[PDB]
Amino acid sequence: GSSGSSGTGKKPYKCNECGKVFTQNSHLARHRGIHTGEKPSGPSSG
Ligand SMILES: [Zn+2]
After folding, report:
1. Where are the C2H2-type Zn fingers located?
2. Is residue 1 one of the residues assigned to a domain?
3. Which of 17, 27, 33, 44 can pair with 22 through a Cys bridge, CB separation 3.0 to 4.6 Å?
């Protein structure tokens, strides 16, 4: 007695970070990089 769910992501490979899709996983894995990094911890003072 409830709406049944179905379908995870027909797409080949999507970026759970932004949502970009890449036919080839390799393209995605490498892309995800654009996200990681550039995460400083406040001021440096050095
Ligand atoms: Zn992304």
Report:
1. 13-35
2. no
3. 27
